[PDB]
Design a protein around this motif. Structure first.
Motif, mmCIF file in Angstrom:
data_model
loop_
_atom_site.group_PDB
_atom_site.id
_atom_site.type_symbol
_atom_site.label_atom_id
_atom_site.label_comp_id
_atom_site.label_asym_id
_atom_site.label_seq_id
_atom_site.Cartn_x
_atom_site.Cartn_y
_atom_site.Cartn_z
ATOM 1 N N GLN A 1 -17.616 -91.270 -1.588
ATOM 2 C CA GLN A 1 -18.763 -92.579 -0.392
ATOM 3 C C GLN A 1 -17.858 -94.181 -0.609
ATOM 4 O OE1 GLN A 1 -20.834 -94.045 1.908
ATOM 5 N NE2 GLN A 1 -21.525 -91.573 0.676
ATOM 6 N N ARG A 2 -17.625 -94.939 0.208
ATOM 7 C CA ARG A 2 -17.480 -96.030 0.183
ATOM 8 C C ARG A 2 -19.260 -97.127 -0.110
ATOM 9 N NH1 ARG A 2 -12.880 -96.106 4.146
ATOM 10 N NH2 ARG A 2 -10.479 -95.601 2.212
ATOM 11 N N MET A 3 -18.777 -98.109 -0.972
ATOM 12 C CA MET A 3 -20.562 -98.546 -1.406
ATOM 13 C C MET A 3 -19.903 -100.638 -1.585
ATOM 14 S SD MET A 3 -21.448 -97.047 -5.033
ATOM 15 C CE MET A 3 -22.228 -95.231 -4.184
ATOM 16 N N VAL A 4 -20.265 -101.469 -1.109
ATOM 17 C CA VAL A 4 -20.702 -102.109 -1.035
ATOM 18 C C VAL A 4 -20.415 -102.730 -2.547
ATOM 19 C CG1 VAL A 4 -20.697 -105.170 -0.094
ATOM 20 C CG2 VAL A 4 -21.295 -103.564 1.528
ATOM 21 N N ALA A 5 -19.385 -103.558 -3.554
ATOM 22 C CA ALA A 5 -19.397 -103.572 -3.750
ATOM 23 C C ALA A 5 -19.852 -104.849 -4.976
ATOM 24 C CB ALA A 5 -17.190 -103.942 -4.500
ATOM 25 N N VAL A 6 -20.653 -104.683 -5.899
ATOM 26 C CA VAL A 6 -21.538 -105.299 -6.671
ATOM 27 C C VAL A 6 -20.261 -106.124 -7.571
ATOM 28 C CG1 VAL A 6 -22.914 -105.333 -8.979
ATOM 29 C CG2 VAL A 6 -23.699 -104.906 -6.670
ATOM 30 N N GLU A 7 -20.332 -107.451 -7.707
ATOM 31 C CA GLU A 7 -19.140 -107.916 -8.656
ATOM 32 C C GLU A 7 -19.242 -107.922 -10.297
ATOM 33 O OE1 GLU A 7 -18.880 -112.863 -10.359
ATOM 34 O OE2 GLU A 7 -19.591 -112.485 -7.914
ATOM 35 N N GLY A 8 -18.823 -107.715 -10.808
ATOM 36 C CA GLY A 8 -18.222 -106.970 -12.389
ATOM 37 C C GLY A 8 -18.573 -105.836 -12.482
ATOM 38 N N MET A 9 -16.754 -105.092 -11.408
ATOM 39 C CA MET A 9 -17.089 -104.159 -11.239
ATOM 40 C C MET A 9 -15.705 -103.338 -10.810
ATOM 41 S SD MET A 9 -18.772 -101.657 -7.724
ATOM 42 C CE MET A 9 -20.198 -102.197 -7.987
ATOM 43 N N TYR A 10 -14.723 -102.517 -11.750
ATOM 44 C CA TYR A 10 -14.015 -102.880 -12.111
ATOM 45 C C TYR A 10 -12.434 -101.879 -11.733
ATOM 46 C CZ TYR A 10 -15.160 -100.625 -16.798
ATOM 47 O OH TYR A 10 -15.391 -100.220 -18.216
ATOM 48 N N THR A 11 -11.969 -101.206 -11.416
ATOM 49 C CA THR A 11 -10.826 -100.171 -10.731
ATOM 50 C C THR A 11 -10.442 -98.422 -12.102
ATOM 51 O OG1 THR A 11 -10.361 -101.124 -9.142
ATOM 52 C CG2 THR A 11 -9.513 -98.723 -10.274
ATOM 53 N N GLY A 12 -11.350 -97.965 -12.550
ATOM 54 C CA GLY A 12 -11.539 -96.735 -13.948
ATOM 55 C C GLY A 12 -13.315 -96.950 -14.128
ATOM 56 N N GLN A 13 -13.981 -97.855 -14.024
ATOM 57 C CA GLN A 13 -15.166 -98.058 -14.533
ATOM 58 C C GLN A 13 -16.556 -96.519 -13.231
ATOM 59 O OE1 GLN A 13 -18.049 -101.274 -13.819
ATOM 60 N NE2 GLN A 13 -18.941 -100.577 -12.437
#
Lengths: 62, 90, 49, 107, 72, 246
Positions: F73-85
């Motif tokens: 799935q592709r969400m709209v990203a809330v900030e404070g959210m990183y690649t690996g999380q």
RNA sequence: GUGGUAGUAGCAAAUAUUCAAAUGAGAACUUUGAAGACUGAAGUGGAGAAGGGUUCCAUGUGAACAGCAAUUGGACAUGGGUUAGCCGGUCCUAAGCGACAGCUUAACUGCGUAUACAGUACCUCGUUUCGCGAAAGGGAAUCGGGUUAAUAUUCCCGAGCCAGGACGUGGAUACUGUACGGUAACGUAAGUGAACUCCUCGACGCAGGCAGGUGCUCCGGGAAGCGUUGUCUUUGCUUUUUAACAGCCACCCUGGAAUCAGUUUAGCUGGAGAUAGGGUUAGCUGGCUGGUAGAGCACCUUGGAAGGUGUCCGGUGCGCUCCUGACUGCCCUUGAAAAGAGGAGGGAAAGUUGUUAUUUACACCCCUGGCCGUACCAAUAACCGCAUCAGGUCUCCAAGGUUAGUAGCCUCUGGUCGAUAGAAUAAGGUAGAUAAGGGAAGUCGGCAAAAUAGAUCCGUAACUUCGGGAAAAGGAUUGGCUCUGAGGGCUGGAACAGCUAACUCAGAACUGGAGCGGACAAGGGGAAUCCGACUGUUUAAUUAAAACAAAGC
RNA sequence: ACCCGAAAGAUGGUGAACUAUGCCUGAGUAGAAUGAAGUCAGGGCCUGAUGGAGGUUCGUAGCGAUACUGACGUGC
């Protein structure tokens, strides 16, 4: 024949030049030659073991 | 040499657009072209890939953030308050 | 040129209709025919086919 | 002096129609259509290029022997190796921590 | 296209029954010489520098093999 | 006569949206058994600039419950959210940034983004960059919930509806001025062609209701009724109030 | 249908023709020679697309046509000409477009992602609906030389490669179960892998400089032939080439960094392990051999087509071209998809020391490759403008000198002299020059034309949003010849000794009718007012503005 | 309705090869001037290099068309 004369430096007068000094020979090029010359010198002195590790790095930055 | 008096990064935009608008740009253009400290590795090598996206060059990790800084201050307030709301719920 | 086979044959046919009428035809009895009416010059008048 | 003409059907300056000036046994200067430069297999999740295994356009990866298309390891064809160490050190520890609990869960 | 580098392989490729002909080239510089066996996929070829070894080698080729061709 | 470019916009044709290099409609994960009787561990694999919006999209990799395959799935990203999380969607997930709780689990005062109007809506409210919807207060049961929207208004919403905890990324991207026409042009090229707008007063009296006259003025009230037809409704529609605010 | 106008207007842009001989009824105009010019590699050159459709090629000719002529011709007539596994279409999907289920409407139409669409017999799986849409996107594989009146990566000679499918001999591996080596990065002649799943390639922006490479251009030596020669000239010019295909020439280990070190033109890199020492791997259009001299090229001698020699060895660069590589920056712009090829995880199957069984790309060997396009023009005469019309129409390659320069000016290769001629030199025109003294008094108005112009060094105001104004304004110098100084690279171990390669600055002497950016090229400036902030846009063929737009509000 | 004559109305079809705008996929644009952030040195924030930003300026090809109210106006 004209070129033989040019090596002599003739025909290189102010009147002959019709281009800006930067156009004829860029300062970017004159920078590069010099900076490549001087970096080469220091590497062969350091591999010779004349110049130290510490003296090398000071001379590099100057 | 320092080679302008005031306008700094926005000598770029030259002698147009008007000095009030040009100053608004200057202060947030100064933010976005900065490196920021990475959370994850430590090293101050974070650059803005696209608006809202930031990449730590040394780390290789990408993260979300502001348009024009890594951490918007509103988002810093929510990270505080949600940590609190989780603790009191227990 | 980069034509289809259909368009090649339409072109092909209209070469073969672009020749002088046989000499012997006028000689035959009861014919009012003189020189071919439909002859075309490739510059002057055009096909679109 | 001597100047040349495209030999193939495409007479435009795209990626596919990249060309290379050669001179021949004729002493005649002439194009050859060399294709696009193949990207060598960047492979995940690091997206570093893999050592051992050459840049070819992907149909010519058929021609090569099976030996040549991989590295002889676990996950060799598509892994960084360094990345592979991560896989093992995860799967060793994440089994060990999961096992240590399930002996402690006898009480 | 392909080369041969030794006398073990060159005796095999000649005796192999789909080898058609042996064109033999000689050139002055001194007398460096080439044998070339036209087989079926590839044209194998074998450089020899000494003439006296190459004269001995032409005897070692089989007679039931068909052709030979020479410049000169 | 002649149809106004207000009216021509519904016709489709040349005013359609430029969708081609946009990277998929952004949504929450469609309401499962797993999400409503516990939780399901996502992993954030990528963060993407979707063109024609301010927000990033996170691309998230869940394991499927029923088959062997692996969903994305592709969400709209809330900030404070990183690649690996790890993201954790579902009912019994912790209240931390990333995670997708139902609204009744969130204790009031919580900032939420990408909220569902109905249950299983996939996520309509508060999706633009920087925005959020704050929770006000619950029902006695936990059946329905109050939310305060980025407008101001207050909305009753079902508690089994859900959303992401935290603010949407790309925050504060209107505080800059676009200095150039060029920077406006590059903005609206990857959206619809809504730009540049011509003033209706510059037009002739065919093409617009304002246009015409030897001086460049409007000539009747700019304010127009709700009841007026297609092609009357130009200027200030159904306006309660006009002029500078205070 | 036919006059007067009238043998009148007119046939005047694109620098240009001339002399001889041949052909012919007939030559300013055809062909061949000799001279003289032009085009001047963002060419009037060599190749494609769209469009044209036989205009292509040969032989022949009574008209008409080619605004004079015509022996000529894109005209007229009779024949001939377009050869593919590899060049394209074909295959894939893009923006989009046809139909299925149905749904509308009297139909015509309009909408259309809705649906029950492998292991004779027995199971176990099963979510996408068919097709169209690129001769510049994606994509299996080809190159050299020769050849015809007209075709060629298509014919022939030679050397290869690819897709599909395969016999055979001889090698590897296993036979209580799929090879080994290296610490590693990874490696070698081979080295099984079903269902299902994940991944890679296909697959991607723009600008900037930097390094390396192909081709071009350039300098010198050697060997051929050629040119000049009253005079000088170890001289000036041409040739000296090598194809696709095939083989070989960032990351790991040791180690542990502050007196921080390494390093680029530019910045970056490093206890999330730097320098250094030793490895592994990627590569190009790099080097050597094969292909390959038998070919191609340049010459010489006997026949009246036979036979020979030679094709060698080095440099140079901010050079020009296209390509690669790693970097740096820019964005409220973050820069396609699918077919198809491959990898991995998984371990389903088979195989008991012999007719076995995995290898159909382990090596060699064997067989087949359909269909259509393929001539020629691509424009001052093959297209469109009613025409052989000073107009228009997408792409590639791109030499020397002068110069910053793909500017202008002259030239080599390739191309052309096609544009009715001859004689006179009135007025009036068209374009182009020049004018004593005065210098806008002309005119609605400095309209037109003059004047300024390059480079170096000096100098530069009001005002200002401090960025600009600014090439502000205002000055001086420049040619030729003869010298002097400063600026590199490679070798043997206080810095010395040898060999040696660039066009770039600075200065001096002498000399000339005081000239010298000597032709070409190349801002007139300053002080104020009105409008619009700026860049951008507009009435195709009377209006480019103060109008439209614009960011900001 | 003596013969010839409108500006127009309506019904049903054909066109984006020119032009207007959007989308998909390709291609294109010498050589100079000015010298923004960033970085390096030396001096006590100045000075010198480095660097190469801009809907920047001069100016080729390409796109355009201000003036002469030039030529031509039974034109090429």
């Amino acid at each position: 024949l004209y070129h033989e004369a040019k090596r002599a430096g003739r025909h290189m007068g102010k009147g002959k030049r019709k281009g800006t000094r930067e156009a004829r020979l860029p300062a970017k090029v004159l920078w590069m030659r010099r900076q490549r010359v001087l970096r080469r010198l220091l590497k062969k002195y350091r591999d010779s073991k004349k110049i130290d590790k510490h003296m090398y790095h000071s001379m590099y930055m100057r | 040499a320092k080679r302008t008096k005031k306008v700094g990064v926005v000598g770029k935009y030259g002698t147009r657009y008007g000095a009030s608008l040009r100053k608004q740009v200057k202060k947030i253009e100064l933010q976005q072209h900065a490196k920021y400290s990475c959370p994850f590795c430590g090293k101050m090598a974070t650059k803005r890939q696209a608006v809202g996206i930031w990449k730590c060059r040394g780390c290789s990790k990408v993260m979300t953030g502001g348009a024009w800084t890594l951490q918007t201050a509103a988002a810093a307030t929510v990270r505080s308050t949600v940590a609190r709301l989780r603790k009191q719920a227990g | 040129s980069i034509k289809g086979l259909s368009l090649k044959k339409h072109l092909g046919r209209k070469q073969k209709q672009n020749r002088p009428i046989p000499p012997w035809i006028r000689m035959r009895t009861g014919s009012k025919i003189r020189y071919n009416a439909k002859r075309r010059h490739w510059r002057r008048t055009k096909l679109g086919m | 002096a001597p100047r040349l003409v495209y030999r193939r059907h495409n007479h435009y300056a795209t990626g596919s129609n990249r060309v290379r000036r050669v001179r021949t046994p004729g002493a005649k200067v002439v194009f050859h259509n060399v294709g696009k430069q193949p990207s060598r297999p960047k492979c995940g999740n690091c997206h570093r290029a893999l050592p051992g295994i050459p840049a070819v356009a992907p149909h010519r990866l058929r021609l090569l022997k099976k030996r040549e298309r991989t590295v002889h390891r676990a996950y060799g064809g598509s892994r960084c190796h360094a990345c592979v160490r991560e896989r093992i050190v995860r799967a060793f520890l994440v089994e060990e921590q999961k096992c240590v609990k399930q002996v402690l869960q006898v009480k | 296209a392909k080369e041969i580098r030794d006398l073990r392989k060159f005796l095999l490729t000649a005796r192999r029954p789909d080898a058609k002909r042996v064109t033999i080239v000689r050139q002055h510089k001194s007398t460096v010489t080439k044998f070339k066996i036209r087989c079926s996929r590839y044209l194998y070829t074998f450089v020899v520098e000494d003439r006296e070894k190459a004269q001995k080698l032409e005897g070692s080729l089989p007679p039931s093999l068909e052709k030979v061709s020479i410049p000169g | 006569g002649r149809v106004i470019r207000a009216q021509r916009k519904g016709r489709g044709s040349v005013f359609r949206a430029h969708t081609h290099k946009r990277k998929g409609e952004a949504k929450l994960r469609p309401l499962d058994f797993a999400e409503r009787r516990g939780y399901i561990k996502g992993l954030v694999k990528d963060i993407l600039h979707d063109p024609g919006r301010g927000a990033p999209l996170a691309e998230v990799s869940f394991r499927d419950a029923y088959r062997y395959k692996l969903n994305k799935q592709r969400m709209v990203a809330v900030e404070g959210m990183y690649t690996g999380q790890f993201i954790y969607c579902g009912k019994n997930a912790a209240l931390t940034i990333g995670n997708i709780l139902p609204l009744n689990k969130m204790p009031e005062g919580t900032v939420v983004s990408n909220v569902e109007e109905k249950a299983g809506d996939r996520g309509t409210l508060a999706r633009t960059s920087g925005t959020y919807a704050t929770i006000v207060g619950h029902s006695d049961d936990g059946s329905k919930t109050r939310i305060r929207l980025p407008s101001g208004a207050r909305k009753t919403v079902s508690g089994y509806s859900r959303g992401m905890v935290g603010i949407v990324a790309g925050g504060g991207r209107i505080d800059k001025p676009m200095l150039k026409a060029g920077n406006a042009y590059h903005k609206y090229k990857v959206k619809r062609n809504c730009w540049p707008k011509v003033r209706g007063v510059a037009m002739n009296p065919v093409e617009h209701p304002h246009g015409g006259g030897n001086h460049q003025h409007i000539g009747h009230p700019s304010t127009v009724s709700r009841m007026a037809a297609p092609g009357q409704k130009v200027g200030l529609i159904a306006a309660r109030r006009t002029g500078l605010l205070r």
